[PDB]
Amino acid sequence: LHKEPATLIKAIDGDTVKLMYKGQPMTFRALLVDTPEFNEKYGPEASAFTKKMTENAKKIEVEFDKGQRTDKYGRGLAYIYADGKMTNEALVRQGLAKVAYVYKGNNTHEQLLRKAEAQAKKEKLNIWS
Template identity: 45%
Template sequence: MRKIGMLIAILLMAGCSDNELNGLSGNVTYVVDGDTLDVKLEDGTVERIRLLLIDTPETKHPTVGVEPFGPEASAFTSQLEGEFVELELDVAERDRYGRMLAYVWHDGEMFNEMLLEQGLARVAVYPPNTKYVDEFRAIENEAKNAEQGIWSVENYQNEMQNDKPAEGCTIKGNINSRGDKIYHTEGSSYYDQTIPEEWFCTIEEAKSAGFRAPK
């Protein structure tokens, strides 16, 4: 059991119920793709859920089309259809599309983590929801080293690093060879040549994530 799962077990043994820990629960009624699904909550409402801190390859994007391992990611998540899941929220509850943002738990395992382990997703950081980012990066690195899934595709990592940011989020977060976390705004000297590992909408978000301005 990984670090996150061990933490959950400890909390449960300490007397925290599943509902207290994960907040919401219900049954999966439909899987849109690898990182998006519909859940009918126990109060009868249906929420579209976007899995937090990960991004799976596209299968239905109007311009990108079907990406490598997109169908595999969708098929992997489809095993949740009809299953009971628990939803753990982070700081921001919804994205700009109104979807609920959550870590999805099934049978005591975090499904976001499982997709990363299989190489069917990459880490995608959108502050302030960064609760498990360090753990997720460690799992992603293991999948990369094992050339699992998407990481078996030549140049996949370099291509994904150049993804366009969300609208209005143009601050680049980069980690240099010494491990320094530095953010670059559009007016920074090295902005154009900087390859972003994270995108931020505001300087405050970048600082909250541990990034500093360039010297």
């Protein structure tokens, strides 16, 4: 896989961000994770985490997987990186997202994220208490 440039337009919630990609605005949905909705427990803490990560980054990048690039809602599906650090992994590592929506052909970083979830769970973090 490989990283392509994008700029933050707006952080939306824990697992969705509006980015400008190849010069067009697009909502991106973070592969392989599930943050709570904003109205759910740790929903607000998830939104804040992603909003800070992406807004503070000097450099946002998107990395598509080997399968479907847009979901049925026209959202882009990608691994999202902020100054080289994967948002999707960081959310799981802090127990602000569960590993979820693992579809075949779009699951390159599954076990890296599962490894992060296991640590979060061992540490009894946020979602895991």
